[PDB]
């Protein structure tokens, strides 16, 4: 068959909110809506992963990709809010240094809007100043103690401050610094990063909270 899709496919718009400092993020060419398979599943159900360096305009943030569930469609418009986040693969390669400890935790959280969000997190042992030893190893009960201080601090500053305040706490890494200065009483633990945040199903479609984000 000669299918050739030039006329039936259109150039939608995908746009950026107020906390994402750029104006536009995408101009996305998918398919024209019409009867016999209307476009709401070929629309909104798509997710949309881009870097944050152009979004908050600081190009030092070339890591930390985000997924974005499409949620608001007008004709020749879209406006996309925060759904997913994952750390960048070669930088989670670039933080693995031999002779100290990598720390993993897979925390399951839900927000008071019953938002099922996991927080996959990885921290790294700091080699102290004035240290001539080639190692900085931990003691595995010290690692366990680190990790219930980890889920202690993420449970202490989780279960509140909903997604405007939550991703407004995620992107300028307040979680990392509160893990750092909270957990350095036991063990120094620099390079605290938040590898993945997992939403699976946003339970609603509703436009009031979406325009409350916009």
């Amino acid at each position: 068959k000669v299918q050739d899709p030039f006329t039936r496919k259109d150039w939608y718009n995908i746009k950026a909110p107020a906390p994402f400092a750029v104006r536009d993020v995408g101009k996305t060419l998918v398919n024209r809506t019409t009867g016999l398979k209307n476009a709401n599943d070929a629309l909104k159900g798509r997710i949309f992963e881009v870097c944050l360096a152009d979004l908050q305009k600081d190009e030092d943030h070339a890591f930390r990709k985000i997924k974005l569930r499409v949620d608001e469609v007008q004709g020749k418009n879209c406006l996309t809010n925060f759904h997913g986040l994952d750390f960048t693969t070669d930088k989670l390669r670039s933080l693995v240094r031999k002779w100290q400890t990598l720390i993993e935790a897979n925390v399951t959280v839900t927000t008071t809007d019953h938002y099922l969000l996991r927080l996959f997190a990885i921290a790294f042992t700091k080699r102290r100043p004035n240290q001539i030893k080639k190692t900085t190893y931990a003691q595995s009960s010290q690692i366990r103690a680190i990790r219930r201080k980890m889920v202690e601090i993420i449970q202490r500053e989780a279960a509140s401050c909903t997604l405007h305040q939550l991703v407004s706490k995620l992107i300028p890494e307040v979680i990392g610094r509160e893990i750092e200065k909270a957990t350095q009483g036991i063990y120094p633990l620099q390079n605290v990063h938040i590898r993945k945040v997992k939403l699976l199903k946003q339970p609603k479609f509703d436009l009031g909270a979406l325009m409350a984000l916009h």
Partner: peptide, 9 residues
């Protein structure tokens, strides 16, 4: 593909 990864150009 587009900036989401759905539509094969």
């Amino acid at each position: 593909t587009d900036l989401s990864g759905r539509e094969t150009i």
